Design a protein around this ligand. Structure first.
Ligand SMILES: NC(=O)c1ccc[n+]([C@@H]2O[C@H](COP(=O)([O-])OP(=O)(O)OC[C@H]3O[C@@H](n4cnc5c(N)ncnc54)[C@H](OP(=O)(O)O)[C@@H]3O)[C@@H](O)[C@H]2O)c1
Length: 243
């Protein structure tokens, strides 16, 4: 409902996706949480609770039941390269399928259900097509995620596209979280961010109308070298980019 949003987080058994799933129904009481995972093994990893659905984002009908009744969607799915040290993408699970088409299917399902806001987590690097991450497995993942992104901006539903810096497994809530535009942060050395702060930015984006129709790159500063961002109003405000 308008005042108690059902929020579906997809890739909920993922590393960032799981903290997003807990902060939706825990650190928060302003949401009814729903999660989408790719397997039964993923559903157990996160508790195996009732509000978790199983589906494959490459088969739209298998994920449609997850969208029924939702008000917002946080996409935290990604093609994931596997190593045979040389990495590769399993068949039918390449970035084109998982990240372009896989996301396309989520975004269409959401429009159907009348979502008032789709949040997508991507990666810095998209302004550079020759970026090293595209070689990892022969996928060009960064370009494919950009195609999904542009499709999201193109759909008509209010969106928030969050292009994160290198992901870190470090405590959230205790850093100077930086926000930029067009890979510029890659010139710096403050181009990486804890998973927990990305999970927090998705949750906050749900609370501030300012995040609507915005696209920004997200990085942070070392811990201890600044006051923990606690005021997200300001954080989103400095973002005027739509893409
Ligand atoms: N490389 C970096 O440092 C970096 C930098 C910036 C942004 N990012 C991005 O930011 C996001 C968060 O990263 P992360 O490591 O926290 O995520 P990740 O945990 O390790 O996982 C996303 C996870 O996505 C799910 N998934 C993959 N294919 C699927 C399919 N066909 N159907 C359903 N679910 C599927 C996976 O399911 P399983 O449970 O089955 O594995 C898993 O839940 C990703 O989109 C990533 O691309 C990464």
């Amino acid at each position: 409902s308008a005042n108690l949003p059902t929020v579906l987080v997809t890739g909920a058994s993922g590393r960032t996706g799981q903290i997003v799933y807990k902060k939706l129904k825990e650190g928060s009481d302003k949401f009814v949480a729903k999660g989408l995972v790719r397997s039964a093994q993923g559903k157990e990893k996160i508790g195996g609770e009732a509000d978790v659905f199983i589906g494959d984002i490459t088969d739209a009908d298998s994920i449609n039941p997850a969208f029924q009744g939702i008000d917002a969607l946080v996409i935290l799915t990604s093609a994931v390269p596997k190593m045979k040290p040389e990495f590769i993408f399993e068949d039918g699970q390449y970035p084109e399928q998982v990240d372009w088409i896989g996301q396309k299917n989520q975004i269409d399902a959401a429009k159907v259900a009348g979502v008032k806001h789709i949040v997508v987590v991507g990666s810095m690097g998209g302004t550079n097509p020759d970026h090293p991450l595209n070689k990892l497995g022969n996928g060009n993942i960064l370009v494919w995620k950009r195609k999904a992104e542009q499709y999201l901006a193109d759909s008509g539903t209010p969106y928030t596209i969050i292009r994160a810096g290198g992901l870190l497994d470090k405590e959230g809530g205790v850093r100077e979280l930086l926000v930029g535009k067009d890979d510029e942060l890659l010139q710096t050395d403050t181009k990486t961010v804890p998973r927990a702060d990305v999970a927090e930015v998705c949750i906050q984006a749900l609370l501030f109308e300012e995040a609507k129709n915005k696209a920004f790159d997200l990085g942070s500063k070392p811990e201890g070298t600044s006051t923990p961002t606690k005021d997200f109003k300001a954080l989103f405000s400095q973002v005027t980019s739509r893409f």
